[PDB]
Each structure stands twice: as structure tokens, then as C-alpha cells.
Amino acid sequence: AGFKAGVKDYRLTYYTPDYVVRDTDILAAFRMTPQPGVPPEECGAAVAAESSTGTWTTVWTDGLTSLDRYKGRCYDIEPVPGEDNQYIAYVAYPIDLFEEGSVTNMFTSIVGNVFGFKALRALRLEDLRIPPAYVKTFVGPPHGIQVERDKLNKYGRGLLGCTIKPKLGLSAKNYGRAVYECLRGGLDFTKDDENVNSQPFMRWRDRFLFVAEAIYKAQAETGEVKGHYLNATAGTCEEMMKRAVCAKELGVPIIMHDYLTGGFTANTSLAIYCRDNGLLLHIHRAMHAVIDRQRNHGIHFRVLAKALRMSGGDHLHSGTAVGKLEGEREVTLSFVDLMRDDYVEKDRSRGIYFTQDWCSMPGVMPVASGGIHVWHMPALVEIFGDDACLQFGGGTLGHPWGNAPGAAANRVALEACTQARNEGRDLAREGGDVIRSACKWSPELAAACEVWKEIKFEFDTIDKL
Amino acid sequence: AGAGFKAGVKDYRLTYYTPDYVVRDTDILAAFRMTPQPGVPPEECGAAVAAESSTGTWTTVWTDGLTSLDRYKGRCYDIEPVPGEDNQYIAYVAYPIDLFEEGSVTNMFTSIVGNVFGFKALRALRLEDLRIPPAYVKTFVGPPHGIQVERDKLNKYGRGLLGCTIKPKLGLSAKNYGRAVYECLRGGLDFTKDDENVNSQPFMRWRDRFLFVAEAIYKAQAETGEVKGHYLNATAGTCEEMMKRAVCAKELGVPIIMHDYLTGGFTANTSLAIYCRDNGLLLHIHRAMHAVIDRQRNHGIHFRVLAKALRMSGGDHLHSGTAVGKLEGEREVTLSFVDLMRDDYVEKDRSRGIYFTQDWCSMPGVMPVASGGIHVWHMPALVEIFGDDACLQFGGGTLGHPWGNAPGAAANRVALEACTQARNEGRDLAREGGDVIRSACKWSPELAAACEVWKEIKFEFDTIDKL
Amino acid sequence: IVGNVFGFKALRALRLEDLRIPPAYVKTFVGPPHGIQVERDKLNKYGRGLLGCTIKPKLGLSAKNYGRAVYECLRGGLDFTKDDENVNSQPFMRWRDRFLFVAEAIYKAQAETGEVKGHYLNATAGTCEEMMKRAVCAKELGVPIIMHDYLTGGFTANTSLAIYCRDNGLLLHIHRAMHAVIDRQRNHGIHFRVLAKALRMSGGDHLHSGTAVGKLEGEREVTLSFVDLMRDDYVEKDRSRGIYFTQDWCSMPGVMPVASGGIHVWHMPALVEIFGDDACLQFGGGTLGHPWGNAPGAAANRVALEACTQARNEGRDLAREGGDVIRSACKWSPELAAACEVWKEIKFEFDTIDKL
Amino acid sequence: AGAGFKAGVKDYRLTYYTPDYVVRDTDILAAFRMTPQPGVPPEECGAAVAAESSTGTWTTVWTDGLTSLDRYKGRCYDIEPVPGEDNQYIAYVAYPIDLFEEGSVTNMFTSIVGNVFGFKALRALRLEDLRIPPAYVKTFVGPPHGIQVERDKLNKYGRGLLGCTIKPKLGLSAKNYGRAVYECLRGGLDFTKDDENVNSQPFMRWRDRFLFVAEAIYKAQAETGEVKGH
Amino acid sequence: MMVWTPVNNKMFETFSYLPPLTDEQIAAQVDYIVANGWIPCLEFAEADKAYVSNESAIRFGSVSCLYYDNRYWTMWKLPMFGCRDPMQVLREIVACTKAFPDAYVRLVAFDNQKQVQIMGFLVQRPKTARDFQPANKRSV
Amino acid sequence: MMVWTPVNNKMFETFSYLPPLTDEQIAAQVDYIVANGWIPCLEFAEADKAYVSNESAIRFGSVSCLYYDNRYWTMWKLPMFGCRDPMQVLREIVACTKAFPDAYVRLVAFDNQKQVQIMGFLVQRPKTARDFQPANKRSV
């Protein structure tokens, strides 16, 4: 076997249906739509080749190494029922292909170029099996759910937060004023909006100082630990770190980062800084729906969530099912389990293509946020249980009596639903009764219930399983 | 009493649909291709996009009264139905310059594309274009050097530059990497490069590669008498690791590094571009992952926006597509990327998918890089599309030559120079290109061997991302 | 001295028994960061042995549970608690989380009792840079003491850490993990007396000495030789004690011996008799195994120690009257009585391998 | 009443001898050659070694109940009597990967060999082997270069490399050290080396040696045309 | 519009925003502990040690992030490992509050699989406390 | 199970966990000082200066390690160098406590060869002190 110049089919090297996957291989499940006339075996092989070791024509240098050892392998292809031209192609990648601890590198191989190939009409990465041997190369989340609860001294219920609004346009002093009023009413956290970084209307360091004053005021007033996710997202790594250092120096508990718009390289650096300095790290998934909305093309959020758990974050937005942004109940639950649990079994009915073993990597707190309000509380508690943060921005700052009553309304709702569950009530069946009873008891909650009673977000789902 | 706080939900269009708004020269403008859910009016959908990418949320908040929503709100100022579509619209949104962090592509994307693509009320959304005004452009450091400076540093004029990705993508040792690099460069290529996914791995650690590659660069440069480089990949898992790799390149005195701007991310990329400016390194940008975002017509972000973003964040080269190679990118769309990345001023032209006039206010131009499944027979088409200010990259097209890398390189170099000469002589490459290559394959044995192996190889498929 | 010669084909076995370190060489070492007198002075603790306790289970506790256990131990009358030698940073408990919760616990117990408290925070790490980061955190928390596993971390790291502790005013507890790999057998290896001298030179404020009576091997007379070699300024040659050379320490500070491992309240008189006041006596299982929990466990140990100390001061012979002293104390203190009952039958009596 | 806290001493084997345990592919495994004291059963000795190198101490502690000993405990899962020895056994112990600090050989040794070799209940103990699973191996940076890279940097292939320790071990001056090095290297050795105990001493300070050795390396390399090192 | 009072309105984490728990309601929470196999425990603190504070930070460099004093309270006896009898828990509540009638007392429970406290609420406050409001006086 | 009280249960280092020392027991400790040739001394402090505190650390950078205020007390007269008469020591205890009836007073002794305090215990607390428990009230 020597060097023969020229083009041959990818399938001769990269389609290996008799391959038995190794427990250290990274596996990918791609939903692929070949161009007409391109056999699925050749398409799957092309995806395997061009995401691992191969190019479009035979190269002599292959002979200096062992393609057998390094090649990506398309090892199974299954037609998708109800589709005439969609297939799931399974690809196995040797662990040697990957830089240790680098989500950036993993994505560069698996999703770097293959989505642009002329020979395919569409491609979606549905799932990735990250083996324990690769998981162990990552620092991972700075703290994780248990440590976070222990540092905050908060147990037995979901956490409550709130994004300050309007998104942009408030001064630093008005930002802290809004924060103090929200926190003092019973919210655990407030947060910078994802796009609040540093701007002409409000420079970051001014915000950080006034927010620190607000946190400490509300904490002293209520006797409960408080925090506000200060946004470290910035134009450069140096600016991001400056922002993290100021948070450290103010003694405040938590910062946030937009991992996709800032990027994985910055995110991983920030997570390492947070581990080393004891800061909690809230992760905002801004831009994810550019990538993860459509069924035929992109990357499913389950992969983006796994990637974040690896790169590092103490919280990650999960979707709400019931709010203004898309994300069906069962898919949301799959995200919750993948981000919190140590071991998640393959379950195709849930969209989980591979068994995922996290080998004791800390769990990430899911965050439910976006167009939620008090009437959603029983459904949210039922979906997430206690280990979640539920965020009410509009649902707090839109309360007719202001932020502190808005916060109290949300806190009473959460506590009433939690108490009812503990007492043995079935929130899926009796949730309406539970919230109604609470609205009849608390004037603050009653005011919220009245304003938002008719408000629902019910649309056809785009990202169906 | 005047206008006070009224709690509750109202239509976004009451505040955010402003069809009589006259855009300001400092506004950032966005053109969104929007597919509303049944029963949602386009005006409401456009208003929702403007609201939730600027100042608004789903219910009225009292804090609006403390500031001036008029001053800060994003504004949907025009909606046009799409010809040939029953439920698609172009919604135009204007954002005041005050909404944006100076010098931060990260911040600009966080607002414009952060949340709105996930709204239940829309079925699909694509960001087609952005108008970046000069007053915002001027806040960016931008490309470390740009085309003119790069040519002047390399002492290379009068033709496209030639490059080549080492293959196999992964699996070569550091020493074999340098061996392949030396053989490629010495045959007539200006550059070689690490594959986008070559960072640091068990089979080859980055610092070993950088050293052997340095030896190869300097060997080939001494042999040929022409300046040589190899794009050493600084892409890494953390900013600290990325910077260590850039520092090593600096300390070896080599000309150029590379970064995967989308998989590494804008925050890291901007930092790296600033480092390259301060230390005199060229920065080649690979667009790995772009097609995840930019392939489909109905949803995502068009590459023209991702290209503008990179010019702002900073890069000396950026992959543009080839038209004729293995990856998708139609000729006219490729030319729009070329002009948007190279030129100082690009006029609105809907026929080209250019929705806004773009003024770069003297920000340096970025060298387009044509790469992916190209070979010698494509040379006339590439020279005709790109002219001289481009890098043409042949990985498989060099390392797949039957006589090895140096003859492969020479074949590509002869083909390029033959087409350039013909162009200069007034020959129409669009019509005479085949003749030019055939004449050159007859003269050069190295080229003849390449011509024979790849004569029948074409990449012709239905285009997904049609204008 | 020990680099290559133990592997020579021409010998069947080789054991380094002793080293005479002359004053002119001793004087080239920074030595212990503080030493016994300075440690007592910083802690404001005089007139009795110090009492400590290793948190258990060895591994598997969360950072918050670690601090919880520490607070409960310290508040009952122990001077110190400690990380187990193998508690460094792990998936179940990362080091910085532990350091913070332990700081909370130390300061809570100190405020509650009015006595200075500490917890030996383990700086032992995979690299010198990681070790130093851990030391720096302890410095920044204002806590009194850290620990290092000198043999598994190694002498180069240990010497660096001791110098850091001198420069920043941290006490340094030294754990001798791995020593028995080297020092157990009579025919081959290096006797602990040499490993102890080496530690005194490299630097440590405390060093484990063995107990005689507990779960790990170390006969009474040999233990006493370690105590004298680590504490005293001058130790005369005495072959009957296994001391092959006169050792002159030329004013190098003394290291506090630490008696640890399978000891409990019934051993208290023997321990006080062996060590006198200048030692730390550590009760891990002997505190966290008390039927009423950590604070009562700590109180039991503190009462036992104080009762034995008082009795000794009064002229009672602990070698002959020790049993009576503990019995009288168990009758007076309910906490001690509960400990006495649980461990009454528990002894560790086996043939000694490392005989002189 | 479920299983609660019972103060006092019980046999280690009740918790730490688990002969039916199926080892996981991520467990660190140890093979210990153990010699128990008379009257100590091998199961109890093996269990004690497992316990005291993982989670256990000599008496029952209440804090076990706050965590999961099943998840964290070391497990003696097999005992083999030794060929020709009445009182020697190989005890096999499995340690969950969670017990170990990533990238730290120091930590791994501290658990596995930290205290157990000193237990009164054993007469002797030898650690014979360790199975380091891939998931733990991958947490280490490992060798700076390794064989292939070394050969490639030195440009040396097709034969063993040749070296030489300078002698006498101690007592040479820096200038005489470099003199000896140059003469060795120039005659065909690839490497010379400092003796293990040559660090910095009154007869030869390290930086003086490093400079003269540099001169010697470069002189021999220029003379022979082969890469040299010391 | 009602105004949430900032004066003497201190809270106590889970369930502090609800009406005070009746004996029946406390009993139901204990049933929930037992039903789920969690480990009940009681903790208590004198008034001066009840709420988070910062005093120890005087000794620190720039390392106060997520450090607070008074998160740890004092354990009543030991966690009730193996307890499957709700009446035993309630009896310990009576015994704890009898021994420390001027202390704050909270009932907590631990999950040993997650290794975290999984529930908790206040069961006693000192009669002398004047820093909290009854439910109907939280807003004015 | 008895619970060790965290409230008003301050201790005083050596011998504080035993029953209060009788006059005979104090005399026996003095005999021990004299028998060993150690140097007796008395020290005293007002209540506010009796227990370790952190207040001076407000003036520091990151150098609080093993710094505490109130470790030093005030010397009564001078150490009794050359004293070999236990009755003289006992008389000074009386004189010191009479002069400062509201102060904490401790008896200490020094070894000039080790150059360290070699023993010490409290001999008086103020009658107004309410921050300590009698032996039978240390657990409940």
C-alpha cells in the first residue's frame, strides 16, 4: 500500500460500519441532509474525514503516520423516520485528536468546516458523547450547585433572581437603586442584562460600586445573603479580567459572562479566575438561538450546554418552557439533567443520543428566565425542583407597586409552591389552586396575579425532537 | 396628570415601531429577515425584535420613566415584504450609538443577536446586514496591519499570495510537520499553515511544532531568497495559553500567526489582534464554525456580517470562500465579501445582498483567503475573481501532487504566475483561462503532472445560501 | 549519602541508622520557621500539651461539612484540627472552598471559647506553584497554621515552604506520610531518627513522632529519642537509645513532636508521661468517634489532658497512678465518662518490627 | 430505624473488604504484598490497608453518614496467598478516581503509601504495582518531550544514545569539569552529565560549571558536527 | 400601593415570607424529610450569632468573596442518622427549644448523596427579638 | 447525649476545663513552681482586655497571621526572681487580687533556660463576669 495521487471516495477510508467504539472516543451524532445523488455513506464519511484527518484528494503524508490510529470514523448511519432525505450519522473521534481542557479545540474539529460542504444541504450536530477521560482534562465549573448553596447558606427552595430593566439606558446610580429595591423584597439575586457591559450612559466601574452598595444594604436589611451578577463580558480578555478583579476587590459574591458572544477561550479563562478567587460565575447564553433554533441545521443546545459545563460556569440559562422564548418541557428537562447530574442514560425519546458520564464534574445550576411571572411558579417548581434559579425581570420591575413588592410577590409565590409540594400536593394537578390560595393571602402577590392573569406564551414549537 | 407608569403588557409596536423615523448617521442599522408566527403582524414582530435587542422587555417597567426611552430605544423604522415569500419580511432596526461599548464586537453582537432569535413569536430570523457608522468604526483598533502594510513587510507585490494547509489535518508529528512545511515553501509557496484544528495535542505539542516550523521557514527563505511564513495557530483553550503561543512566535522572529475567531471567540480575538499590532505579527483569521451560523437562508447570521465583525475585531487575512471549491459560496456573494473586507467604501446594492452603504473610514483592508478543494485548473477563475489582493491556499492541491510538496508548490506558483502574466497582457481570463493553463501545463512538467491528476475534478452542487 | 549505594550488587541490605550533622553545616540552614517557644508565644498557650484532631472520614467530606466538623471540634476544647494528609484538592472538596469554610470555623470557635484556635490547612500539592498559592491564601485569611507532607511533596518543596512560612509568620505542621515505606524494617532503609533530623534542617514547626501506644508502630524508647532529637539543643551519643552520634543543634529551634494515630482518652496519662507539655496530642477517631459528637469528644480529651497535667504537677506518678487519674476524671466529667466507656477495652499491642 | 451512628471499634473488613466488587475502568488499583501479624486474618489486614489509605480510621465516626462511604471508600476486592510463603498475601485495593487530585503524583502517593506501611497490625508491606487508569493519566502534563521528540530535536536516529557521568563524583573545579566534558563529547559521546550529587558546592559553584560546560558542549559540537549535550 | 418596610423586617430564608408554620405544618415538613430518607438535624444560635456578619474580614487581604461569619450555627446533638420516625424529630425540637429558650433554632435536613442540606426553616426565635414583623405588618 | 453550650461558656486556657482550683490545689501548683526552680509572676487585665481580639488589624496590610491583641496582660510588680518560698507567692496573689478586685488575674511561671512561660492559670475573675459557666452547666 503506497501513495496514489488523486481523488477517491471518502467512504473507502472513513466509513467503517464494523467499528466498535472505544470508551475514550468522543462520539458525535449529526443530523445530515445530503445533496441529491450523494449516498448517505459518502456524506457521513465526508463529515468524518473533514472533521478529523482528511481532505479532498489523497495526500502522501498520510503514510508517515497511522491513519488507522487518528481518523474520525463514521460507524453508523440511520435514516430519520418521516424524512426522505435526513440521516443520523454517528462519528467516533480518537481522544488523541483533542487538546486537553479546550472546548475551543473540540468545536474547531467537530463543527469547524463540515457545515459548509457543498455536498450537504444541511447539517445539525445533535449530541456529543464526552468520555470521562476527556472530561477529566477540564477544570470545569468554578464551584457548582452544592458549593454555591453552601457559600450562600441557601437551602430548601429555588433561588430567585431578576434582570434589571430597561435593558439599556439607566445610570449607574439608578441601576443600584433598582437593585437595592429588588433585593430587599426577597430576591436572592439581581443581574446586569446580557448587553449591559460598559457604555456612555453607564460605565462599568461606576455600576459595580453602586451595585456593591445596594447588595450590602439589602443584605443588612433582610439578614439574607444577596448578590448581583456583575457582567464581566468585554471587548478584550484584559478588560474582562479588570472587571472580575474589581468584583473580587469589592468582596461581592458573583459575576456573569456571555459565553458565546465573549467566546469559549475567554470563558474558560474567566472560570479559572473565578475558581482561584472564590467568585460565582453566572453564564448567559446570548446568541445560542442563532445556532440552536432550527431542526435541520446548527448545533442543538444540549451540546452547547455540555460545552459550557466543560468550559466552566456555576449557572447556565436552560429555558423556561412557559415563557417568551422557545424551549419545550421535555427538552428543557433534558438540559437540566445534562447540566446537573453525574450520569445521564441514553434516551432517544428525550433527544439524548448518548449516555453521558460526568465523572464527578460539578453540576451547573439551571436558570429559568424570560417572560415568566407569578402564575408560572407552580409549573416552574414542578419542572426544576429546588436546584434552579428562577429569574423575573419584567415580572419584578413591572409590578404595579414597584420592585420590593414585586420581589416579595415572587418570593411568596415560590415559597407557597415549595411548601405545598413538601406537604404532598401535586403541583402538576393542584398548582393553580396553590397559586390562587397564595394570591388570596398576600396583597403583594394578589397585585401581581391581577396584572398578569391573562398573559401566556403559546406558539407552535420550531425545535421539535 | 401626564404620562405615568401603567403596569401590564402592551404591544411592542406602540413604542418600537417608528416608520417615520429618520435614521441618524451615527446609528447602527440592522436588516433582519423575519418569519413571524401565524397571527403575529409583521409590525409587531419587527417591534419585538427592536425592543428585545435594545431597551425593552415583555411587560411595562416603571424604571423607563427615570431615563429617556426616546434617546435609547432601538427602532424598527421600515418593513419590506420579501418577493417570492408569503411570510418573510425584511425589518430594519436603528440602534443609537450610545447603546454600544466602544471597541467591543462582543457587545454589539450581544445586543443585536443575543436573545431575539429564540422568541416564540417568530419562526425564523436571519441577520442579513449591519450598517456600522464611522463614529463607531473609529472606536476599534481594527486589523493589526492590513493589506498594504502586509505586502510592504513581506516585500511581495504584483500577484496573489500562495498558501497551503498541511495535511493530514491531525496526526503528524512536529518534525514531520516542519518537513512538510519546508518542502512546500521551498517550491514557491509564500505561506503554509496549521490546520484550524491543529492547536496542541498528544501527537504534536505546540511548542515543538513552532520550533521545527521556524527551522523550516528559515531554511526555505534562505534557499529561495523570498520571504516565507507559516501561520502558527495560537487558538487555545484559554487566553493565557493563546498569549503564550503568540509570545513564542514573537520570540522566534517569525512573521505570522493564526486564530480561529469564532471558536476562540471575539473577546480572545480582539486581545490577540491588539497583541499583534503591538508586536508586529501578522494575524491570519480562520472562520471555523461560520457555516453553523451562516449557511441557511431563513435563519442565522449572513457571513457578510461575520466578515464586518472580524474586520472590526481585527485580522490581517480572512477566509472568503472560493466559489469553485468544495465549500459553498457563490461567485457574486464571494465578491461582496471581498469588497466589504478590502475596500474603504461599499455602496448599497440589493442585487449583491448589500443592504447598507458601508463606510470604513480608513480602517485597514483585510486580505481575503480563498481555500478549500481548489487546484491548478481553478487558477484562472481565482485570479479573475480576486485579482492580486488575495491569498490562494492549496492544501490537498499541494500535498496531493504526485511528485511531492516542492513540485506541488512549483505547479501552483507557475499556474498563478502564468495567469497573472496573461491578465497583465490584456487576456480575458473568463474566456481564455483554459488556454492559459493548458499552455502552462505544456511548458512546466511539475504543472503538467498536477493538471493530469485533477483534470476531471469539479465541485458543482445546488447552492443553499442563495440571495 | 543515600543516592546510589543502597542498590549495589555487592551488598544484600543497607540501612542508614544515624547522621552526625556538625554545627558548621547546621548553621547553613534556615531551619524551622518558628519552633516551640515562638509557637507557644504566638498562640498564648502554656503549661500543657496542645490538643489536635484530624477530621474524618479521611476523604469524601464537602468543604462545608469539613468546616462544620472543625467548628464543633475546636469549640469543645481542642487547640487545633487538621486536614488529613491526603486532603489536598479533589472533586468532592476543592481546596479554596475548604480554606474559606475552615477560616469561618476557626474564627467562630475562637470567639466562642476565648482561646486561640487553628486548623492545619494542607498546602501539599502537585507543583510548587500550587503549593505556594495555597500558602498565600492561608496568609490572606489571617489564619495561624498550614501543613505539608514533607516526604511525598519532597525536601525541595518543603524547604521552600518553610522559608515562605518564616517570611510570612505562618506556623508549619509537618506530616511524615510515606516515612514507614523507608523506616520500618531493621535491615534496610533509613531510620526515622535521620528523617527527623532532616526535617528539622529543612524546616517545620511540628513533626509527627509516633505514639508508642497507638495504631502505628513506634516503641517508647525510640519515640523518646525522636522527641529529644527534635526538641533539644544537644543530644549525647547513647547506643542503648540507638543514638550513634552526639548531635549539637547550635541553637536551631526545636520542633514540636506530634503524637497521633489510634489514641484515645485512656492513653492520656502515658502520653503526658512520655512527652511532657511540649507536644501536640492528636485525636481524630478519638474525637469524631465520641458517641455525643465532636464538641463533647473534644471536651473529653481536654478534661483528660488537664486532669493528667494537674496530677503530674501535684507530684503524682503518672506511670503508676495514671489509671486512677483517668478513672477519677471519668467519674467527674459526663463527656469523659462517655469516651472512657466506648474505648475501655481498646489497645494496640503487637510485636515490634523496628527493634533497636 | 435505618442504619445510624454506632460509636466504637469494629473490624475494618465489615466495610472495606468487598470480594464481590467489580472494578471500574476509572478506579486506581493497587497490589500490596502484605505480611500480617500473627492472629490477624488476611481479610482484616487487607481491609485495614484499604481503609487507612482512603476514608477510614480506627473507630467509627459519625461524619460518615453525611457523605456516601460506598462512593468514596477504598475496597480490598481480592486476596491471593503468595507462592511459598505461609504468611504473605497480595491484597488488591481499588480506589475511586474521585479520591485523587488531578495531575498530582504527590497526592496519589500520600493516600496509597502515606500511613499504611507503619501499622502495628502488619509486619511488612510492599506496594508492587498500580493500575493508573486513562482518565487519571490524562490529568497529567507528563514528560516534557518524550522519545520521538527528543530524537527529532537532537537529529539522532538508528542507534542507542551514549552518555557519561563525569568523575570523580565530587571535587573537580568548574574549569576541570568542562575540560573533561569537552574531551568526552569530542570523542563520540552524545551526552555527558553532572553526577547526581553535583549541585553547587565549595569546590565548584553551579553557575561557573554551567558556563564552562556550555563552552565545552559548543566546542565539541563544532568539532564533530554532531549535536551534543550535557 | 403598599410599601415594603425596611425597618425591623429581618427574614430567615426558606418559608420566612409565609405565615408562621403551625404545629401541623411543621409536622408535615417532618413527614417530607422522613418520606425522602433525609437526615434531620437541629441547629441553634444566640441572637448575636444569628445573622450573617463581616467581622472576621478585618484579618483578611482581598479574599472576602463569599466569606461571611454566622453561617455556621451550633449543632444540637448529632444529625439523626437512620431516623425514620417523625415523632422522634418533633421530640428533639421540644428538647432543643427547652434547653435553649432564648436561642434561634432551625430544623434542617441533609441528603448524603448530593452531600448538601436539602431543606431548612426556623422553628424558634427569642421572645425578646424586635427585629422582625408579623405578616400583616411587612408592608404599610 | 449532652450538648456542649456555645453561650456564655468562655474558657481561660490551662485548667479551665477542671473544677475551680481549691486553695489547696493552688498551693500545690505553687509548690510545683518552686520545686522546679521556675520564676513565679502575676499578671492581670480589666475585663475588656482579657480575651484575644483583632482590633489593631484595621491598621494592617495582609500581615494578621498570628497577630492578636490582648495576649499581653499587665505585670504585677516583677517576676519573683530567686523566690524559693511558696508562701511569698501566695501572699502576692492576695496582694494583687486585693489591689485589683475587678480584674482578671493569672499566675504564671517562667523557665529562663527555655526562655518561655512554663505554666499558667487563672486565679481571679471579676464578680460581674457573666460569660462563663460553672462546671455542671457546661453541657445541657
Ligand SMILES: O=C(O)[C@@](O)(COP(=O)(O)O)[C@H](O)[C@H](O)COP(=O)(O)O
Ligand atoms: O434579556 C432578557 O430578555 C432577559 O433578561 C429576561 O428578561 P425578562 O425577565 O424581563 O423577560 C433574559 O436575559 C432572557 O430571558 C434570556 O433568555 P434565555 O434564558 O432563554 O437564554
Ligand SMILES: O=C(O)[C@@](O)(COP(=O)(O)O)[C@H](O)[C@H](O)COP(=O)(O)O
Ligand atoms: O480544513 C480545510 O479543509 C482547509 O485547510 C482546506 O484544505 P484543502 O486545501 O486541502 O482543501 C481550509 O481550512 C478550508 O478551506 C476552510 O474553509 P473556508 O476557507 O471556506 O473557511
Ligand SMILES: O=C(O)[C@@](O)(COP(=O)(O)O)[C@H](O)[C@H](O)COP(=O)(O)O
Ligand atoms: O491518617 C491518620 O491515620 C491520622 O490522621 C490519625 O487518625 P486518627 O487520629 O483517627 O487515628 C494521622 O495522620 C496518623 O496518625 C499519622 O501517623 P503518624 O503520626 O505515625 O505519622
Ligand SMILES: [Mg+2]
Ligand atoms: Mg437579559
Ligand SMILES: [Mg+2]
Ligand atoms: Mg483547514
Ligand SMILES: [Mg+2]
Ligand atoms: Mg492522617
Ligand SMILES: [Mg+2]
Ligand atoms: Mg552518578
